[PDB]
Design an enzyme around this catalytic site. Structure first.
Site, PDB file in Angstrom:
ATOM      1  N   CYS A 170      36.295 -50.102  -1.682  1.00 30.19           N
ATOM      2  CA  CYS A 170      36.972 -49.529  -2.841  1.00 30.19           C
ATOM      3  C   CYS A 170      37.840 -50.557  -3.552  1.00 30.19           C
ATOM      4  O   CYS A 170      38.467 -51.407  -2.914  1.00 30.19           O
ATOM      5  CB  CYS A 170      37.826 -48.345  -2.414  1.00 30.19           C
ATOM      6  SG  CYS A 170      36.781 -46.958  -2.178  1.00 30.19           S
ATOM      7  N   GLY A 229      35.911 -49.734   3.073  1.00 36.36           N
ATOM      8  CA  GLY A 229      36.802 -50.799   2.657  1.00 36.36           C
ATOM      9  C   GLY A 229      36.472 -51.457   1.338  1.00 36.36           C
ATOM     10  O   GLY A 229      37.212 -52.347   0.910  1.00 36.36           O
ATOM     11  N   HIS A 235      43.596 -43.399  -4.722  1.00 36.93           N
ATOM     12  CA  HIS A 235      43.576 -42.799  -3.400  1.00 36.93           C
ATOM     13  C   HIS A 235      44.038 -43.759  -2.309  1.00 36.93           C
ATOM     14  O   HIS A 235      44.013 -43.332  -1.145  1.00 36.93           O
ATOM     15  CB  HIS A 235      42.188 -42.229  -3.066  1.00 36.93           C
ATOM     16  CG  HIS A 235      41.131 -43.261  -2.809  1.00 36.93           C
ATOM     17  ND1 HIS A 235      40.117 -43.526  -3.706  1.00 36.93           N
ATOM     18  CD2 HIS A 235      40.907 -44.065  -1.744  1.00 36.93           C
ATOM     19  CE1 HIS A 235      39.323 -44.462  -3.212  1.00 36.93           C
ATOM     20  NE2 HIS A 235      39.783 -44.811  -2.024  1.00 36.93           N
TER      21      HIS A 235
HETATM   22  C1  LIG Z   1      36.532 -46.787  -0.398  1.00 34.49           C
HETATM   23  N1  LIG Z   1      37.141 -47.580   0.400  1.00 34.49           N
HETATM   24  C2  LIG Z   1      35.406 -45.899   0.129  1.00 34.49           C
HETATM   25  C3  LIG Z   1      34.010 -46.463  -0.197  1.00 34.49           C
HETATM   26  C4  LIG Z   1      32.845 -45.714   0.458  1.00 34.49           C
HETATM   27  C5  LIG Z   1      32.747 -45.707   2.001  1.00 34.49           C
HETATM   28  C6  LIG Z   1      31.235 -45.756   2.294  1.00 34.49           C
HETATM   29  N2  LIG Z   1      30.709 -46.422   1.102  1.00 34.49           N
HETATM   30  C7  LIG Z   1      31.497 -46.292   0.013  1.00 34.49           C
HETATM   31  O1  LIG Z   1      31.179 -46.579  -1.151  1.00 34.49           O
HETATM   32  N3  LIG Z   1      35.624 -44.558  -0.467  1.00 34.49           N
HETATM   33  C8  LIG Z   1      35.946 -43.406   0.172  1.00 34.49           C
HETATM   34  O2  LIG Z   1      36.127 -43.396   1.406  1.00 34.49           O
HETATM   35  C9  LIG Z   1      36.050 -42.116  -0.651  1.00 34.49           C
HETATM   36  C10 LIG Z   1      37.507 -41.639  -0.664  1.00 34.49           C
HETATM   37  C11 LIG Z   1      37.541 -40.220  -0.126  1.00 34.49           C
HETATM   38  C12 LIG Z   1      36.128 -39.801   0.220  1.00 34.49           C
HETATM   39  N4  LIG Z   1      35.301 -41.005  -0.029  1.00 34.49           N
HETATM   40  C13 LIG Z   1      33.966 -41.135   0.133  1.00 34.49           C
HETATM   41  O3  LIG Z   1      33.342 -42.117  -0.308  1.00 34.49           O
HETATM   42  C14 LIG Z   1      33.214 -39.988   0.849  1.00 34.49           C
HETATM   43  N5  LIG Z   1      32.394 -39.300  -0.147  1.00 34.49           N
HETATM   44  C15 LIG Z   1      32.749 -38.116  -0.658  1.00 34.49           C
HETATM   45  O4  LIG Z   1      33.724 -37.436  -0.332  1.00 34.49           O
HETATM   46  C16 LIG Z   1      31.818 -37.576  -1.764  1.00 34.49           C
HETATM   47  F1  LIG Z   1      30.612 -37.186  -1.300  1.00 34.49           F
HETATM   48  F2  LIG Z   1      32.392 -36.519  -2.371  1.00 34.49           F
HETATM   49  F3  LIG Z   1      31.618 -38.527  -2.691  1.00 34.49           F
HETATM   50  C17 LIG Z   1      32.375 -40.438   2.097  1.00 34.49           C
HETATM   51  C18 LIG Z   1      31.962 -39.171   2.874  1.00 34.49           C
HETATM   52  C19 LIG Z   1      33.275 -41.301   3.001  1.00 34.49           C
HETATM   53  C20 LIG Z   1      31.109 -41.235   1.724  1.00 34.49           C
HETATM   54  C21 LIG Z   1      37.914 -40.487  -1.573  1.00 34.49           C
HETATM   55  C22 LIG Z   1      39.400 -40.403  -1.882  1.00 34.49           C
HETATM   56  C23 LIG Z   1      37.043 -40.025  -2.730  1.00 34.49           C
END
Ligand SMILES: *C(=N)[C@H](C[C@@H]1CCNC1=O)NC(=O)[C@@H]1[C@@H]2[C@H](CN1C(=O)[C@@H](NC(=O)C(F)(F)F)C(C)(C)C)C2(C)C
Ligand SMILES: *C(=N)[C@H](C[C@@H]1CCNC1=O)NC(=O)[C@@H]1[C@@H]2[C@H](CN1C(=O)[C@@H](NC(=O)C(F)(F)F)C(C)(C)C)C2(C)C
EC number: 3.4.19.12
Lengths: 306, 306
Positions: free
Chosen positions: B145, B143, B41
């Site tokens: 990820c 950040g 992603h």
């Molecule tokens: C990677 N950089 C982040 C890590 C997140 C941010 C908060 N703590 C973490 O572990 N990942 C993301 O932003 C991913 C990204 C889109 C959505 N997302 C989420 O983590 C969101 N969660 C969801 O959509 C859910 F509930 F389905 F898991 C969020 C609302 C920001 C917590 C993708 C592509 C999965």
């Protein structure tokens, strides 16, 4: 989100750990530039530990009595000296992996990471706090002496602890890197006990703020107390008294959650008097005091290092 | 003595972390030989996350759309491909710090260390377990990820986890290094929830043995139970059932303490029915399930790595 007992990355320290052998005694040393630091009791035998005379023991040694190995490479010892409770071994090769570093003495209530080592080889990393009675609740087996504790400030490693001994209650005592003990302990096998420990109040408050940041709010209330009213309750439960300096330190966490420090004390006051009653906070059923205000900010804001 | 939540030393992993930027999205990548692995992603914008079509998004990119930095040095991307949920970026320079490594998929109940990272820079290290519902209880901010989870086996780093997302309950989901998710999750911003979690029984037993090794004996008793009688009680409290394989795994800890596995189950059985009643075990007021039998042996016997 989330909250974990988080240690500093240990890479920069792993490159400084060496094995030091003198006689039948092997332990760990810290190799920075052309000096290897290690506990001075490496020069002791079994007959010596009850009442060692380290000046006598050291004069009876020469450079070739000390075997220093950095992995497989042997380091040639070209000079030795004693500084308080640490031995400084001058070697012919400067460690090319020497990071930017300094030697700091920390205060009770501060936290640091420990790189536990055996035979010069890193085994594990964990976080702990210096207790108000100058011991740490570590995890250490035979051979772990010379393992070090450290913090990282941007690019700079601050070494603050070298491990020397386990006390009979199972807690751990050591020195700063200048060889001065934390607490009233000595490096001999006499009858030594730690004094009574207390809970680190400013740290408990920081942890309550971390809980609020992470969505645990059930312990909050509308009350407010004063510093003197709180401290009167804290002393009854063997909590460290709270000062205005602590209040100021908690400032950033107060601003981020919109909850005033003295408001949070009233919650803590209630938790001490009524208990938690089968509820948990951040996955704990006890009040956690080994996170500083700065640990919480770092973990709930995401400061990195380079 | 002592018992701490101990992570593996992170040095060998710190040398593999890089920053990956595509567009306005920056995250972490793992640089092994001439390949950089990162979450796919990274190629998404805000319009794309609700219903991304990653095959379409990827064909519309070229090598120069991907900015890879290892500290200050920029890495030239000479080829890209998708493997399930990870992007593999071929670069012109092989990482000279590449450790001996392998890619493993772990099972629920197993533990690993997490090197949390931001902008390619390591921030902290902590230990966690893969939960029976295929989530982990991590600590991660925006950040993070591409941060990885790992174990160390002698000289070999086994990578088992790459971080992708936070679920609405505040727990974390990710993939193995082949890009296959743990659990029934997908890398899009849809409504996903973890299933109900259970307590990892074999791990609780290992932790009770660690307590005995460290001098906490108050919960022991003379009773013995059977596997079927215990499992009938465990299911009532949402504990994983215990198998003969688990019994055999607990063997070394049984031998060292002279307490038979089925004896310890009777203690656990009592703790589940009567609670701990304001007593603690190894400094906890709850039963801890994130230490495997092998974690306990390692920490209470002192296995190192090279
Ligand atoms: C990677 N950089 C982040 C890590 C997140 C941010 C908060 N703590 C973490 O572990 N990942 C993301 O932003 C991913 C990204 C889109 C959505 N997302 C989420 O983590 C969101 N969660 C969801 O959509 C859910 F509930 F389905 F898991 C969020 C609302 C920001 C917590 C993708 C592509 C999965
Ligand atoms: C260094 N290699 C070990 C580390 C110890 C061993 C168990 N866990 C640890 O942290 N240090 C020692 O063996 C030091 C060493 C002599 C005695 N000693 C002890 O740790 C002993 N304790 C004490 O004598 C006491 F109680 F006073 F602290 C022991 C009984 C082995 C726990 C010297 C020179 C201090």
């Amino acid at each position: 989100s989330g909250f974990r007992k988080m240690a500093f990355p240990s890479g920069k320290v792993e490159g400084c750990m060496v094995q030091v052998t003198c006689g039948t005694t092997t332990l760990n040393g810290l190799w920075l530039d052309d000096v290897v630091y290690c506990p001075r009791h490496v020069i002791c035998t079994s007959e010596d530990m009850l009442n060692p005379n380290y000046e006598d023991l050291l004069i009876r040694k020469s450079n070739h009595n000390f075997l220093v190995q950095a992995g497989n490479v042997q380091l040639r010892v070209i000079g030795h000296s004693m500084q308080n409770c640490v031995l400084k071994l001058k070697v012919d090769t400067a460690n090319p992996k020497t990071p930017k570093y300094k030697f700091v003495r920390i205060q009770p209530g501060q936290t640091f990471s420990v790189l536990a080592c055996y035979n010069g080889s890193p085994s594990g990393v964990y976080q702990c706090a210096m207790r108000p009675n100058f011991t740490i609740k570590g995890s250490f087996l035979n051979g772990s002496c010379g393992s070090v504790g450290f913090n990282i400030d941007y690019d700079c490693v601050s070494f603050c602890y070298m491990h020397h001994m386990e006390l009979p209650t199972g807690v751990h005592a050591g020195t700063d890197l200048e060889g001065n003990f934390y607490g009233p302990f000595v490096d001999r096998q006499t009858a030594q006990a730690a004094g009574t420990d207390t809970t680190i109040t400013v740290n408990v408050l920081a942890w309550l703020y971390a809980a609020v940041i992470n969505g645990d709010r059930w312990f909050l209330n509308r009350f407010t107390t004063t510093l003197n009213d709180f401290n009167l309750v804290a002393m009854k439960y063997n909590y460290e008294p709270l000062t205005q300096d602590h209040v100021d330190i908690l400032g950033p966490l107060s601003a981020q959650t919109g909850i005033a420090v003295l408001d949070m004390c009233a919650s803590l006051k209630e938790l001490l008097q009524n208990g938690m009653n089968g509820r948990t906070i951040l996955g704990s059923a006890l009040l956690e005091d080994e996170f500083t205000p700065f640990d919480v900010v770092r973990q709930c804001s995401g400061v990195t290092f380079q």
